[PDB]
Ligand binder design. Structure first.
Ligand SMILES: N[C@@H](CCC(=O)N[C@@H](CS)C(=O)NCC(=O)O)C(=O)O
Ligand SMILES: N[C@@H](CCC(=O)N[C@@H](CS)C(=O)NCC(=O)O)C(=O)O
Ligand SMILES: N[C@H](CCC(=O)N[C@@H](CS)C(=O)NCC(=O)O)C(=O)O
Ligand SMILES: N[C@H](CCC(=O)N[C@@H](CS)C(=O)NCC(=O)O)C(=O)O
Lengths: 284, 283
């Protein structure tokens, strides 16, 4: 019967999902400077649920004509360890996407953590975060909630249900029960409010949709049936409402490398890229 | 064992926190929350997440910010107090800490410890830099904490410490990550006195009760396992922050175990630290 050691040590031979990238130590593995484009915002990211939050926000800002939200979204393949380049570590020492630099300052200001990037963009431009203190505070409560909940959905439920090479009943049960509890909190909130934090769409919706909205629409971990996604009537209503917004349809495909080819735009350097550079146009 | 097509909730599970954990949210009983005389009403327990907030409130009072006066009411999460109707009304997620600011009508509810730290920093104007670069870097680390603690607590703490059955696969996954996060923090503190820069902020208050106390042996009985003495900069900073007068006080609010002089079950007036700690209630 297994007993932990007095002092944990790393077995590099264990293998398994993300074996090639996960380590007990942080920092750079190689020297590479990040590319920088002509736009004021430089984003270094991948179209996972956390990258999508940020590119949905950027697209929503552009739809309101916000010229300062123009951006270059450079692809960082986390499977290849691009997050451990010297250049990437300088923008985010935690080596996770998304990471952004705002080049309208000197020196440029780095922003890492998807939730921090959403708050930074909301404050910078003044949209998608209410002015009223009570409404702003509710919006922040739900944004934080997501930032504290996604780790359970991804690092817990998604890991054990989808990626782990061994199906562990105790861990699947613990993390599926919690993912359901979180969906239930979200469902009972959306029963009473059009959007997560109230009557208006905010950065809280943008943070939550790529995780909880996509999970119930079948888009993450092949888990909608296992999670009984159809039982969360109000999550479904809201996930379809937010998912149909034109800026969400564009934001959700930026830096995306899975799904239908016509729903992948591997980098974004101008608005016209959506017309000409999606992966369905690059098959020859 | 193979997962089902659709997960169903069995009982017969009696593992750690199995008696409070459910796949559904909402109240288990009806009870109103107590309300005291002070402007800020806190409903919490002195776990790492409660301590973030009581530290901030004590730091603000140390600066003479009288509007941070607070009632810190005890919520016993092991008794299901987080599932009363009154508690669900302040935080529909049923976790502590949760706070209401009764200087508004209706009072403004604030839930998630990181949301509370931000709300208080913005309300009073302390512990969140005004310079945009420094402000942004403080928020990066605060959000980093809020996204990292789930792995330290609901992963590492759960599988290493609380679960009586030690599941090697899970313990290796979450220990590795705990150490990676410690190393991030150590490499940052190698270059900076506080987590976000030169000055103490809400980011230190968020991170200390988790990563600071883990390295000092205060959480999960894990310092040896984690090789915590290897993170020299986390140790330096953890000791430096722990010496702060307001940290010494904040860390004991709503604590219900440990030495008697390190337990103040509720805080309802500043003199409670002199009169009403569990050691002083000894007759
Ligand atoms: N708390 C984070 C989590 C970010 C995150 O988990 N990014 C993942 C991809 S979605 C990643 O970069 N993983 C790289 C790795 O684990 O090495 C945030 O909200 O930004
Ligand atoms: N993301 C959270 C987590 C809060 C949390 O995990 N609270 C725990 C105590 S430290 C809790 O109330 N647990 C009660 C339960 O799980 O039923 C926050 O930062 O406030
Ligand atoms: N270090 C990895 C990389 C995979 C990954 O980073 N997953 C992301 C989603 S793409 C995640 O669970 N993020 C948690 C969060 O968003 O807080 C792992 O072993 O789980
Ligand atoms: N629902 C429980 C209760 C235990 C609990 O709430 N743990 C807190 C620490 S006291 C936690 O890990 N919080 C995670 C966070 O702060 O994000 C669990 O099964 O993990």
């Amino acid at each position: 019967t297994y007993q932990p050691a007095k002092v944990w040590t790393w077995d590099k031979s264990a293998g398994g999902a993300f074996a090639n990238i996960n380590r007990p130590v942080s920092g750079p593995t190689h020297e590479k400077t990040l590319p920088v484009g002509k736009h004021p915002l430089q984003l270094y990211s991948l179209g996972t649920p956390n990258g999508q939050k940020v590119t949905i926000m950027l697209e929503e800002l552009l739809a309101l004509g916000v010229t300062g939200a123009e951006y270059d979204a450079w692809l960082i393949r986390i499977g290849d360890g691009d997050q451990f380049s010297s250049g990437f570590v300088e923008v985010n020492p935690n080596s996770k996407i998304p990471a952004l630099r705002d080049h309208t300052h000197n020196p440029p200001i780095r922003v890492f953590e998807s939730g921090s990037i959403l708050l930074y963009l909301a404050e910078k431009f003044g949209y998608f975060l209410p002015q009223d203190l009570a409404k702003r505070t509710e919006t922040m409560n739900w944004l934080f909630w997501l930032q504290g909940a996604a780790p359970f959905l991804g690092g817990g439920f998604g890991h054990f249900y989808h990626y782990a090479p061994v199906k562990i009943e105790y861990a699947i049960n613990r993390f599926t029960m919690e993912a359901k509890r979180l969906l239930d909190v979200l469902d009972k909130q959306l029963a009473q409010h059009k959007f997560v934090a109230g009557d208006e769409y905010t950065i809280a919706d943008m943070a939550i949709w790529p995780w909880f909205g996509n999970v119930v629409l079948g888009g993450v971990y092949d888990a909608a049936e296992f999670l009984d996604a159809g039982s969360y009537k109000h999550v479904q209503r809201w996930a379809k409402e937010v998912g149909e917004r034109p800026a969400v349809k564009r934001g959700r495909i930026v830096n995306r490398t899975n799904g239908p080819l016509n729903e992948q735009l591997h980098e974004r350097h101008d608005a016209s890229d959506f017309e000409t550079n999606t992966e369905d146009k690059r098959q020859g």
